[PDB]
Structures are given as C-alpha cells and as structure tokens.
A and B are shown apart, each in its own frame.
Chain A
Amino acid sequence: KLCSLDNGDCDQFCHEEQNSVVCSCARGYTLADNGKACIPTGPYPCGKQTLE
C-alpha cells in the first residue's frame, strides 16, 4: 500500500521507488533525518498560515 497507506508516513510528497516509499518536500523545506518529516529552511515557508 506504500504511498497509499497514509501517505507512506511522509509529511509531504510520497513516491514509491522499487517497492518502498521515498518522501520529499516542497522548495523551502528540508527532509529531516528520519527521511519523512519536512523542516522549514528559513522564515515564512510556503503553505504555512502566518502567526507573526
């Protein structure tokens, strides 16, 4: 089920390569160490409502 099972546990982009999940992130995010979470590079990352 891979990317079809709950987005493969990816925060953002899920791609199936061979028979496994590969995660990635929009521009302005980097993939965390766990290979799933997307971490913002700088202030005002895309897609985030603003709080200050």
Chain B
Amino acid sequence: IVGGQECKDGECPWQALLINEENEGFCGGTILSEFYILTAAHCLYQAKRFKVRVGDRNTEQEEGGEAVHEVEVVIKHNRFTKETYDFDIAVLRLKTPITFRMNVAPACLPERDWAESTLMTQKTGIVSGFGRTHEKGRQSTRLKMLEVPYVDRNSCKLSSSFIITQNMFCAGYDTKQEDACQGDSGGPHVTRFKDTYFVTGIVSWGEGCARKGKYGIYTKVTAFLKWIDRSMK
C-alpha cells in the first residue's frame, strides 16, 4: 500500500497473506469463512508451494494472534488469462478451519444487485495489504489500509493503456500518491455500509503504483458471486 495508514488493532481482520516456502508474503487474500480464502488467480503463479497466514499485522514480531494454514484445494477461475488478467479470481480451501478471534474474522459477501447499486456507488472502498509502499520500494512489514475512491468506468477506460473488461473496475486517485502496489495483489477491497464491511474487489493490477493519470484495477467480485458460492460448495 502507498499512502494510507496502518490497520490498527482489530481493523482489517479479514486480511490474509499468502506466504512462500521462505515464509515471505507475496500476495494478499480475503477471509470469506473458516475454510475459504479469496485471492487473485495471477497470484497462484508467484510460488509453487505456499501457505496462508491470518491474524498478522507486523511481520517483524510475534503478536500471538497469527495462524498459518495449509492450502488443501486451489480453485482457479478456468477462464483466467495472464495476458489481460481477465477473470483474476481464485478461492483457496484450507486444510484446517480458521479460528476467528481478535484480528481474524471474515468479510461479508454481498448480493450482486444490492452491492452494485448501493456499495459500488459509495464514494470509497478500502484496500489493504502488506505490499510495497512505493512502486520501487520493499514490501511493508506492517499491514496497511487505504481509502480509495470508486473511479468512473469511462475515465478509467480512457486512463488505461490496456483493456478493462466487464470483470474489472477501477479505484484510487488521478494524481494523489496513494495506491495499492506489488504484493497487495489478491488482497481485500471492501466497502463499508452501516459499520459492516463487504468484499467488493480483489487487488488485481495497475500500471505501476500510484502513477499520475492511472488507477488501481480490481477484480469485480460482484460478477463472480455465484462462482464464489459454487466454489465454497
């Protein structure tokens, strides 16, 4: 995350982190239930073997709330394309159930029509992660969050040197230097409504990070709610 603030105790409890064999975070995920993590399909190519860490806020220290979970099944969207990053969505079924506690809790899945009409027309969503704090920086050792404006789909398309499909939306800022960045990918974009936080996106790609005239591109979760349902059996 570029700009924004640390998630403070309790504030980003649906954050997960995909960790490589080196125990290093390479992508984010969102907690959906005791057994299921939402992430980006393009993330599955960042490492051959990986695990999921939940309950983490500071990778430098043991807070006691952390839990590593083995992945049992990787459910990649079959239509995923590396060339356009279209269908950038995967669900992970965990071997052992997540025990919800302080800093560990699921984000809500919304219903499609309500979400598109009510959530995605709000001013802002919240993206979070352990990713890079600037385009060329090192990843953050602190979990961060960032409020990101929904961006008008036609401006986003005008902005972009690449295709924005019906499975993507844009958020973030024209020139202000706050954005998601490398290693946030697969992480939560959530929308707050009356103090309840709903998954609205997955961190997908950008042209750099926080570049002037460029936006954060996110997987449009509301286009995959039946697909997610089926995946969680």
The docked-state distance in angstroms from the alpha carbon of A44 to that of B111 is 20
| Contact partner, A50, options B105, B113, B196, Cβ 8 Å | B105
Q: How far is the CB of B161 from chain A (nearest CB, A)?
A: 35
Residues of B within 8 A of A47 (CB): 106-108, 196-198
| Contact partner, B103, options A3, A45, A50, Cβ 8 Å | A50
A1 close to B (CB within 8 Å): no
Contact with B along A11-52 (1 / 0, CB 8 A): 111110000000010111000000000100001111111111
Report whether A49 and B13 are in contact in the complex, using a CB–CB cutoff of 8 Å: yes
Q: Which A-chain residue is minimally distant from B34 (CB atoms)?
A: A44
Chain A contact residues: over half helix, strand or loop, or mixed?
loop
Residues of B within 8 A of A27 (CB): 108-109
B208 close to A (CB within 8 Å): no
Report whether B194 and A11 are in contact in the complex, using a CB–CB cutoff of 8 Å: yes
B1-50 CB contacts (< 8 Å) to partner A = 10-13
Report whether B109 and A26 are in contact in the complex, using a CB–CB cutoff of 8 Å: yes
Report whether A44 and B194 are in contact in the complex, using a CB–CB cutoff of 8 Å: no
B102 close to A (CB within 8 Å): yes
Count, chain B residues at interface, CB 8 A? 26
Report whether B100 and A26 are in contact in the complex, using a CB–CB cutoff of 8 Å: no
Residues of B within 8 A of A24 (CB): 111
Chain B contact residues: over half helix, strand or loop, or mixed?
loop
Number of residue pairs A-B, CB distance < 8 angstroms: 68
B92-114 CB contacts (< 8 Å) to partner A = 100-111, 113-114
B162 close to A (CB within 8 Å): no
Residues of B within 8 A of A7 (CB): 118, 193
The docked-state distance in angstroms from the alpha carbon of A50 to that of B194 is 15
Report whether A48 and B196 are in contact in the complex, using a CB–CB cutoff of 8 Å: yes
| Contact partner, A52, options B102, B193, B197, Cβ 8 Å | B102
Q: How far is the CB of B194 from chain A (nearest CB, A)?
A: 6
Residues of B within 8 A of A15 (CB): 113-114
Residues of B within 8 A of A28 (CB): 108
| Contact partner, A12, options B105, B107, B193, Cβ 8 Å | B193
The docked-state distance in angstroms from the alpha carbon of A11 to that of B118 is 12
Chain A interface residues (CB < 8 Å from chain B): 3, 7, 11-15, 24, 26-28, 38, 43-52
Please name 15 further chain A to chain B contacts, defined as beta carbons within 8 Å, in addition to the given A44-B100, A44-B106, A49-B197, sorted by A numbering.
A11-B194, A13-B114, A14-B118, A15-B113, A24-B111, A26-B110, A26-B198, A38-B196, A46-B106, A47-B106, A49-B13, A50-B10, A50-B13, A50-B102, A51-B10
